[PDB]
Design a protein around this ligand. Structure first.
Ligand SMILES: C[S@@+](CC[C@H](N)C(=O)[O-])C[C@H]1O[C@@H](n2cnc3c(N)ncnc32)[C@H](O)[C@@H]1O
Ligand SMILES: O=C(O)c1ccc2c(c1)CCO2
Ligand code: NA
Length: 256
């Protein structure tokens, strides 16, 4: 049994009270107060529509993925990754696809900087989408489940779906459950072919073992995964730590 499986078993034993205290213990998070107030009022400038804009910004500002040209955003949801990319100097077009409907977030129309180069299409299940040419491939799909075998299936399906979209382009892909041995086998094969590295984002919650496969980096995937399992396991043992609060992103206004 992997360390990740030990973490998942312990996570599943927590009461709701224990789970709520654990899920943000020692994590980093942006203060969404201003954005949530503005969005409730229907404000369309400055605000990021979700925590995802800051989450992708964390990788971009570290050069782990450098969006450029035509960006595809799979599983765009409200559009946080797409609206953030729309303001980036090298980006020329953003196309987001998301399922929408019951149980799924719908794109939020916004007027943040570069809105005019964004097209968010809902009602689209990416598992039936044929691949398109793009310079940047983003994917943030992977629904958590108390079952790690359900998560394993979900993760392998995303990895198989994204591959034909990868053609010597920039990429950032969520890996929901990176610790199951079958997933590690696929990730090692994918890294041999397309390069990149698996990275844990400090803005992820402790309630998920997600890591992101980014294009600009190198390293040992197994080492990186076990490092996260040990980190998350130890966070159960530690006294509660309020999250490290950071300022949310201002996505401005205007067209380009
Ligand atoms: C983690 S959220 C993405 C958040 C987004 N990156 C942001 O910044 O707002 C993942 C999204 O994937 C969508 N999704 C899940 N399965 C999907 C599928 N089969 N096809 C398309 N979208 C899907 C979900 O509805 C959800 O909105
Ligand atoms: O959970 C952590 O992020 C963490 C990092 C370093 C460290 C600890 C926790 C306890 C002693 O050293
Ligand atoms: Na929803």
């Amino acid at each position: 049994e992997t360390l990740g499986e030990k973490w998942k078993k312990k996570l599943n034993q927590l009461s709701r009270k224990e789970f709520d205290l654990y899920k943000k213990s020692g994590i980093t998070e942006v203060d969404r107060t201003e954005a949530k107030e503005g969005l409730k009022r229907g404000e369309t400038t400055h605000h990021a529509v979700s925590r995802g804009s800051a989450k992708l910004q964390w990788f971009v500002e570290r050069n782990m993925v450098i969006p450029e040209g035509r960006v595809i955003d799979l599983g765009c949801g409200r559009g946080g990754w797409s609206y953030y990319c729309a303001g980036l100097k090298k980006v020329t077009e953003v196309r987001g696809y998301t399922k929408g409907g019951p149980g799924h977030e719908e794109p939020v129309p916004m007027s943040t900087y570069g809105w005019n180069i964004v097209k968010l299409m809902s009602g689209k299940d990416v598992f039936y989408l044929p691949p398109e040419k793009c310079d940047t491939l983003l994917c943030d799909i992977g629904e958590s489940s108390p079952s790690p075998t359900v998560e394993e299936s979900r993760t392998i399906r995303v990895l198989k779906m994204v591959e034909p979209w990868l053609k010597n382009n920039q990429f950032c892909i969520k890996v929901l459950n990176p610790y199951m041995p079958t997933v590690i086998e696929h990730l090692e094969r994918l890294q041999r072919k397309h390069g990149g590295m698996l990275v844990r984002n400090p803005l992820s919650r402790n309630s998920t073992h997600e890591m992101y496969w980014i294009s600009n980096g190198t390293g040992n995937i197994v080492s990186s995964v076990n490092m996260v399992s040990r980190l998350l396991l130890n966070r159960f043992t530690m006294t509660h730590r309020r999250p490290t609060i950071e300022k949310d992103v201002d996505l401005g206004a205007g067209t380009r």
